[PDB]
Amino acid sequence: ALSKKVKLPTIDLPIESVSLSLQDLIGYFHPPDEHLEHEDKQNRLRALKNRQNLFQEEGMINLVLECIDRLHVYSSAAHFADVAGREAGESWKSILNSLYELLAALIRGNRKNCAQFSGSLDWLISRLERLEASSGILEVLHCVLVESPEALNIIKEGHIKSIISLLDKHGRNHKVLDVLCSLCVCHGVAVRSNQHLICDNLLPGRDLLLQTRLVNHVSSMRPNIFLGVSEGSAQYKKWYYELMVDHTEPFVTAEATHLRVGWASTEGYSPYPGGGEEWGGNGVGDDLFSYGFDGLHLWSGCIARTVSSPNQHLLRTDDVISCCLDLSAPSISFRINGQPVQGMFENFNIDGLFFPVVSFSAGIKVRFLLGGRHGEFKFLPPPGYAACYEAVLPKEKLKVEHSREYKQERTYTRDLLGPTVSLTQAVPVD
Amino acid sequence: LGVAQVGRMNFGKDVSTLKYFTICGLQEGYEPFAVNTNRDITMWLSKRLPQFLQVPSNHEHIEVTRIDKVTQKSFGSQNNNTDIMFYRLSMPIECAXXXXXXXXXXXXXXXXXXXXXXXXXXXXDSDFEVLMKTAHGHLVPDRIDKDKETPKPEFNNHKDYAQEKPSRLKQXXXXXXXXXXXXX
Amino acid sequence: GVEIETISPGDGRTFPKKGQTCVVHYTGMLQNGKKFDSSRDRNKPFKFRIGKQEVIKGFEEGAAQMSLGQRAKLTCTPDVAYGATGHPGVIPPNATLIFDVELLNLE
Amino acid sequence: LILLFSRTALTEKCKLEEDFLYMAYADIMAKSCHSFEEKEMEKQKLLYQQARLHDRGAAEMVLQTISASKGETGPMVAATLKLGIAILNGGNSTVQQKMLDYLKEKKDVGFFQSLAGLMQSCSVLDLNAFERQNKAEGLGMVTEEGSGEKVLQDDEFTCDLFRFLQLLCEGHNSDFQNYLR
Amino acid sequence: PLSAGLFKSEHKNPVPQCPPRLHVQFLSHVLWSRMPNQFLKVDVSRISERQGWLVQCLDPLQFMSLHIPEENRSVDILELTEQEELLQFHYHTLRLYSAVCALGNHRVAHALCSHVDEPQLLYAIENKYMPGLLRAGYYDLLIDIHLSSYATARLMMNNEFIVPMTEETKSITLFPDENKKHGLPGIGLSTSLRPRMRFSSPSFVSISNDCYQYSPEFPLDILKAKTIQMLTEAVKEGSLHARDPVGGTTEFLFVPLIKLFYTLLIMGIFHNEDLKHILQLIEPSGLLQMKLPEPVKLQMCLLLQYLCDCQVRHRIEAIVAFSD
């Protein structure tokens, strides 16, 4: 009387009465608990089946279906409140939930009920996108799909698309997957049509579901060199070192062996540069605080850009490469077998304490090439560019840690460590 | 462990290296924590990089509400201390091979930096807001001619930023000095 | 429409030619980097005879322009690889294909 | 095992399943059971053999299996009746009292109406089938029908059922005689 | 036209709606990381030789990671133990993968082999720090994609004994039972008509596959050797009753492994020497005498059922051989 048109509100709307009746009916159709005697549980099951059949005979499932038909024409509690009163508006959602729970409970165990009103699944799936009754509609759909194979016979391509779109719109819901499983198999018998539809409509795109892959462990190796450029004390802003490899394997087990090298920044004036968490498939160049090169592409922020160079190649065995670092006006420069490559990372932030670094996956023998006390140079550095063995501070030892932490294959006797300081040093008195 | 603190942990598995277990514990019926195990403990730690998380309802000094004409997702806070916050949307916009441009239009017309470079990326919408006593700056998906998000601010809008960002895990109160590099 | 990166050289002397079989070893990958196929997971090289259209046009033509002992990255187009329908279930419609093919032997 | 069979018979269904396990184990249970000292010793050991399985629930299990058939002549009832015969051989007053107490404490009609349905369709000789088989034999050497030449169907089952109904009243059990009426 | 209309399924809708997936995320520090229990084994030369600074890495190491696409982030498999929602969702994803190819559906199985991997199934079944639910799910997926079809087909002809009249058939008439011996179940000559096994190679570059009507190919020798290894150290671990069974509780350790072993035994592998080793893995008078849970003994009952069925088949074959 209120929904058809604007009429004077001398109408009976027993909101609390119908809510109490719905709760009482939900309790009336309660399945027996599993912590009961077998005989009593069977008696309760038989009584519940008799009650469900008697309710079916009066066609009251259709009655609650038409009740939710008349009640779903609104959009929200606010929409219902100004039309049917504040109490009805604020109880509308609860009434919808109770009605859907009662509908599910009336049909939870029956095969006959599901076969009887399977003809209404075109309706429920169409209104599944209510967004305030989606859980109840999904529960009813699952409990009607599990029991009667007749319901599966009328499931069409559009319903599969609707369910997949509901999953893609509402997120990772584990009940949608159960519904899909029930659609695929009902009673020891499979539906090849539904299986094929789900297979070719759910995961060609890989945006869903949660993807998966097997990758290789990668770690880095860096020496005790820190390079901080600022006003005042400067270190010539020019560095250079070479690199060679003894043995390498293009594919050791299943994927291409990671092998990159470059210069990595730091966080402020402290070690532990930002980027990958640690123990990943990401080395140097897979973040914005490291810039690496692997022979074909320039890596920066896990985005590779291929670069031209005479005789394109990966870092095969017996390959000598050179790395130059200038800080202020130019940037990090690479040379493959003497002649420079045709790409380099200009206009990058100079904040941080830069250092050389090399990342590898497995099956590799790497040799840093510094001068003087640490080795020879296979090629002549460009003018001005010094090396790391001179970059080391006067009267301090120089060794090579991995990149950040104790990435050592060791037992419980590992020195597990907390935060550190910014070296306490990274102008005369007036 | 605090600053410059290094230690060692022993859950068992080496009774030959459990030094003072024989002094105390072995007599009054105390066992090592993981004595009946065949493999070492995973040893979880507090990770340092602050990745994004969904706003928890049971979180104070932060409240996000959803309403809905046009839709929006409004904010609120009740706190006595202020900081800078790095709110980000759930999932990003993917740019194909050809398309590569981003224009920021204020209350007037287009007037911002030339951020138009993306061969194939995923820009996640975000805004970095300073916490005020009353902070209602929120996001509204609007429509003029194409994809358009309006991060509507309120009074005291001078250090809040609104843009689209890829995976970036850096917690600090700064304006510029953002990580960047131009490959030639 | 298919294009090639050389990654490791294959001494450019022996090519797959009509009336022959080629032994390749590949790790196919989608445009977004999500791997969809690989011949190294099953630990057996892929043997295919050239000229009888038993593989897709992209792989066929890319292998036709390769050499023994070479590594190549083949970038293909949807029309030359799978068309506007793609592979049902695996390859989405209108998707570009990336293959990391290494040539082992040439009968 | 008895509890498993009892729960299977107690679970609500529409028809009693074949349950080859039950059919096989009722066989073994029935065959487990069976000049003055040599006749008293065998009677005492028969009582002991019946006690070996009637205090573990077989007396109620047989009744539940009979009630779960709703009057359908088949191998299930054919085996449970043999088990009842084995468990009720002689005047087993303890077993009779257990059965009567169970029936009275669980006021089920599904046992007595099942018995009535079973007896309504036991067996009758049919002259049509008999003379028809005679004609078939005269026309050609047809192999004899296994189930009593198809003229008397499950005569052994009928004899076992009526032997069960008799052993239930064996002695002078007036309480159960009046209960049967 | 809209922000929301670009990163979802639909694009022709100009109405700016906000589905529940669109939730604001704030950069927070409440997060835990996990230490890998195995490291890369990086060794430095430590000599500082005159020809350079040498570092070495020879031993391979691999791990598997989920890729949350809407967050564009990769997370190790072992980190799912703490995350309850992702754990349950991926378990149900594995269940759906099994369901879409449960019965003899081979096109979907061919799709699913690439949809996950070939070798990560081996990695997951071999790994020890598995959440348990994913261990069982990956075991079931490995069974369903490759072994389930032929295992079912061979179980379909289990109760039918068609025996040829070849000379090799006329050789087991002795059925060794005399001079104080009984033989071993499944050991000897079968010479009985059984369905053959043949698996098609999964290739997605081969246009116009003929029928792919049988199965995706899977290496069986590696799988059976690994099954032997895992059963051996599983019984070794269960003998001492440790407090960290693989996959959590002991049923997660035993039920999927025993199920894979059982279906491998059904398939018609483990030739006589392998069958002997498996027999001495249980029989010496092991695994029957252990305190096993209900599902574990339920599976081992099926194992004994097959061990009796093969004896029945051997008896039938010997009877036919003598009858000839």
Place this chain on the structure above:
Amino acid sequence: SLQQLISETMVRWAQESVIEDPELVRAMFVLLHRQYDGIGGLVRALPKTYTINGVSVEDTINLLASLGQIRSLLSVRMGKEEEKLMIRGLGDIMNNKVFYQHPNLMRALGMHETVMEVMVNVLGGGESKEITFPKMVANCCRFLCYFCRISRQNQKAMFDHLSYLLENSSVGLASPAMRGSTPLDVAAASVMDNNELALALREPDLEKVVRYLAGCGLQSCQMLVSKGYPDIGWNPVEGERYLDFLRFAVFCNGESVEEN
């Protein structure tokens, strides 16, 4: 010693613990019963064993593959590719050479039951509102017809199912599209040319067929009226089929069966 060990462990477990999950206890007791009876397996399996020869092994392998495909398609819901594969398998079983030399092997493998309740799945769903997959029904009917034709005992085997298929024999009538394949026609082929089976044909179902004939002679065919026929007040097609079946039931080997 396997029987000894299994009898050891099965009773040991039940002695140690009270066991929930009735499936486990059922399996344990089935195993124990198998171990003790022993010869039960032999007496259950020898009726299903068979031997053919040492030369035709690959032919019967093709037979077994076809039967396995048929059973796998039985285990899957009814469809277009399903019916095509089932028809191809049935045709392969037709053209098989072993299908003739060893008719006892067909009964041992139970092909008749398999095709019976392949066809029951199709015939279900409805009674007089849908007869879908008519080609599948026809292939099943012709397979059963030929299988019972080339024998003396497959007729007896199909006589057991004759009672059920007469209930739904109304399908496939009033259409000259399969003059052969029909449940009524396979009933006729089973009862065909055997006075033993004709006598064993009791009369629960003769008066059933009489009711069907009376209904056919009273009612016209809704099918034909939808076709566009002038709607004569009776149906002469289904009645003719029923009369043919009754003729085959009554007249056998040139001598009328007196009781029938």
